[PDB]
Amino acid sequence: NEILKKRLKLLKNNFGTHINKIANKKILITGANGYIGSILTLILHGNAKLYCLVRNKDKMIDRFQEICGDIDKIDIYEDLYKIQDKIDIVIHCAAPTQSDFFIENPIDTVDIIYTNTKNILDFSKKNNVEKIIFLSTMEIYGDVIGDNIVEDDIGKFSVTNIRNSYPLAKQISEFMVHSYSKKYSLSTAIVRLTQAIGPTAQINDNRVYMDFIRSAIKKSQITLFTKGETKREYIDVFDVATAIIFVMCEKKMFEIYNISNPNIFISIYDLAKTISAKLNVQVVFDLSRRLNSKKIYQLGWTPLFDLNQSLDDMIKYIKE
Amino acid sequence: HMNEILKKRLKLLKNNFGTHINKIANKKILITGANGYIGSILTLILHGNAKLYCLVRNKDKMIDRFQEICGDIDKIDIYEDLYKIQDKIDIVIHCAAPTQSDFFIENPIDTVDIIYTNTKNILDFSKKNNVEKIIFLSTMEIYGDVIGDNIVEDDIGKFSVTNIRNSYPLAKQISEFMVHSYSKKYSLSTAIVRLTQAIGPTAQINDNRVYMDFIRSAIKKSQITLFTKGETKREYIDVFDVATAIIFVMCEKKMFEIYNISNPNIFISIYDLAKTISAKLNVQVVFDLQYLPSFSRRLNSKKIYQLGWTPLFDLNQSLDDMIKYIKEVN
Ligand SMILES: NC(=O)c1ccc[n+]([C@@H]2O[C@H](COP(=O)([O-])OP(=O)(O)OC[C@H]3O[C@@H](n4cnc5c(N)ncnc54)[C@H](OP(=O)(O)O)[C@@H]3O)[C@@H](O)[C@H]2O)c1
Ligand SMILES: NC(=O)c1ccc[n+]([C@@H]2O[C@H](COP(=O)([O-])OP(=O)(O)OC[C@H]3O[C@@H](n4cnc5c(N)ncnc54)[C@H](OP(=O)(O)O)[C@@H]3O)[C@@H](O)[C@H]2O)c1
Ligand SMILES: Nc1ccn([C@@H]2O[C@H](COP(=O)(O)OP(=O)(O)O)[C@@H](O)[C@H]2O)c(=O)n1
Ligand SMILES: Nc1ccn([C@@H]2O[C@H](COP(=O)(O)OP(=O)(O)O)[C@@H](O)[C@H]2O)c(=O)n1
Ligand SMILES: [Cl-]
Ligand SMILES: [Cl-]
């Protein structure tokens, strides 16, 4: 409770004037039971009227109660076509996010993401939504290398590499989003996220940082199967949520934003080291690319959570 | 008239390639978008030899098209409903797509949705009815930013999500991905053929692709107008040569393969195409300045050559036959 409360209070202090340009907007969040979707719901519910599209209502209640949210101030739907009230802003978070799924089920990866993007843009256009935010991925930059990748950079994709299911589905989605904006004057923004971290992540999450946390707790040891020199950007999930909120507030027909914390670029080894020290174990061995996130800074956004707080909060949160 | 042209063409095909055409007699062949330029020519060449199934949006349109091109309607079965086809189909050739530039940019969303959904549907139909092989007609627009000559099937292009004109290539790219993925997960044999631009007889006067823009302007306006400087160079290929290349690929037994299909002997600037057409119709070419970015590109077509295919028709024959066919109709 206290971890989340301290975070809700810090956000409001730094940016409450912004969260305010959002008072009583009707906000639809798809994939709202998900990591990012649920943190957005938490932050915005009450101060606005929150509609949550999810595959399973009960799963939504359980997640929302766990992270200390008032279910009586969210309207949970399972069927887009039952939402009858007017909607001001849509945040589309719904997607399959398991890497395994991308290679095991590349057909459905494409079909699911394509179909949902289509359905939500159709819904948005028909409903004369004020703005739709589409959550995308740094995987859209594909091959591109550099320490300063801008939104106008563009990956290439082999059609015969099945792991491209997810980036190719997000690319076609992005194209549809821009298209609805140019054709119909529907306000849209795309946000390309690095990789979210911080409290409310679960022990079973298939991400390297959580593999390290799990392995330190269960095996009292973290094993690296390479030298771990690859560097990766991370950003606290609350700082993702606040960035999306800033984008929501910008009146602009079309825009693309990289969302990352440019202070966090860490090697896998260094990540393993700090996690191990935090859990009183050791790293043992058994034998890149950075986005420019300057654009988002121009809205007045800043990230509040550094890697160390994000890890402490995430670990402490799991333990309790 | 028309029929002399067509008969001569079919006889040449038989003389050169009757061997390969024969590897397919009595196969059950489903052609989607069969009323279109390439689909209908494939049907023309193949009906009689083999059992032809033609999926179209409108049966009478397909009847009328097939008779315009001197086909025998009693030797093909036309369907408007995929689900109403019962017989075990051996080979599917997927030809249905929107092809007009204007539609790509006025309707980018519908461009993507139509191509994606039709690809998905025909792949599910194929998988479900244990089809031997499916051939997917793709485009040299797949190569995106790739420039210059000798472009091989493994070369990969980049695409901007903010260029509305990418509706067609992004839709083909995601479809290619789908097609590869079905061959990798279900052991369905798939082929992708990346085509340049077909020309030749039985092109219709309302087509808005550039060759017909020129011909139709020549005839109606007594003048051809370019809207660009026309320095873009492209590859062209006679529609009957496209169809024979597709037939050679049909005969391959290969789990997955991508082929460039072009005539390496035909590479021409838009301008020079305009002037040569204007020579044939006794008009002038003019400009009104004030489309794709103005690249230049040639495909490596060695794989299809390797199967034993050659193109039979030169640019003058293709254009002459195309123009004469159009004069005879209207
Ligand atoms: N986490 C990141 O750093 C990150 C990075 C780049 C992009 N993104 C994108 O941002 C969005 C949110 O990510 P996240 O981290 O919150 O992901 P998450 O925790 O995996 O949750 C994703 C949400 O989508 C739903 N979903 C999953 N499969 C679905 C399907 N087949 N049909 C419909 N809904 C489905 C999930 O509902 P169920 O529980 O019912 O499956 C859940 O509500 C996604 O679009 C994701 O691709 C996230
Ligand atoms: N011609 C070329 O140089 C060339 C080059 C590259 C790629 N290709 C590909 O080759 C294939 C055949 O091209 P083509 O030149 O024969 O094209 P076409 O003459 O324009 O014929 C298109 C075919 O697709 C059908 N079609 C169009 N819109 C449709 C829709 N919304 N739903 C269902 N069917 C639809 C048309 O039927 P309707 O009468 O019902 O509209 C017709 O049967 C296409 O996939 C095309 O992208 C052609
Ligand atoms: N136990 C581990 C896990 C990851 N790694 C390194 O960390 C990188 C990122 O790990 P990951 O599991 O998130 O993703 P992949 O990029 O390996 O699919 C790996 O490519 C390895 O170089 C390691 O060295 N030892
Ligand atoms: N009337 C015309 C038609 C085409 N064009 C040029 O010819 C090219 C090919 O025409 P198109 O409409 O088939 O081609 P895309 O640009 O859609 O590939 C265009 O890109 C323009 O450069 C022209 O200058 N004037
Ligand atoms: Cl519902
Ligand atoms: Cl559209």
Residue numbers in the entry:
A (entry chain A): 2 to 288, 300 to 332
B (entry chain B): 0 to 289, 295 to 334
From the article:
Here, we describe the biochemical analysis of these two proteins and show that the enzyme encoded by HS5.18 catalyzes the formation of cytidine diphosphate (CDP)-6-d-fructose from cytidine triphosphate (CTP) and d-fructose-6-phosphate, and the enzyme encoded by HS5.17 reduces CDP-6-d-fructose with NADPH to generate CDP-6-d-glucitol. The overall fold of this enzyme places it into the well-characterized short-chain dehydrogenase/reductase (SDR) superfamily of enzymes. Unique to this protein is an extended α-helix that precedes the beginning of the Rossmann fold that is found in all SDR proteins. The individual subunits adopt a bilobal-type architecture with the N-terminal domain composed of Met 1 to Thr 201 and the C-terminal domain formed by Ala 202 to Glu 332.
